[PDB]
Amino acid sequence: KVFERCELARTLKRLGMDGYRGISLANWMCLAKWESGYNTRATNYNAGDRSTDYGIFQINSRYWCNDGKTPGAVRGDSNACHLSCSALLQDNIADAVACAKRVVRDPQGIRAWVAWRNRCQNRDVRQYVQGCGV
């Protein structure tokens, strides 16, 4: 599904993302925008290390979900969200949101995504939620 900007904002709000681990809703919006253009079926294979990024938040298979084809995480957690990567391609984003919450529970928080640093950090990100009623 390709979400409309305000439709997503309202969904994320209901899902409890505003201020989750200190991250404002506008930040999550900025991230979804640059990671997938608000598309839940987006997938990006990383030829470089053989991992794949899945869904609206472009969550990586090396650590967060199981796709069976990614060369492990030696021994650490290679499926920290306890999900099949397929779960991150559904139209319903409940699973992707719960996994994104797990990602930010690690020390790097939102910095885990390079796109957030490049396109959202230290920027005026109010634009992403303006007039959505959230």
Instruction: Give CB contacts under 8 A, 24+ apart, made by 102-106.
Output: 102/64, 103/57, 103/59, 103/64, 104/20, 104/21, 104/23, 105/21
Give whichever of 27 and 52 is closer to Cl ion, judged by the CB atom.
52
Q: Which of 4, 35, 77, 95 is catalytic?
A: 35
Among positions 65-84, residues that touch Cl ion (CB under 5 A) are 66, 83-84
39 is an interface residue for Cl ion by CB under 5 A: no
Q: Which of 7, 18, 49, 53 is catalytic?
A: 53
Among positions 84-113, residues that touch Cl ion (CB under 5 A) are 84, 87
Q: How far is the CB of 76 from Cl ion (least distance, A)?
A: 17
Rounded to whole angstroms, what are the CA distances from 52 to 35, 47, 69, 117?
Answer: 13, 9, 9, 20
7 given a catalytic annotation: no
Q: How far is the CB of 94 from Cl ion (least distance, A)?
A: 11
Residues near Cl ion (CB under 5 A) are: 66, 83-84, 87
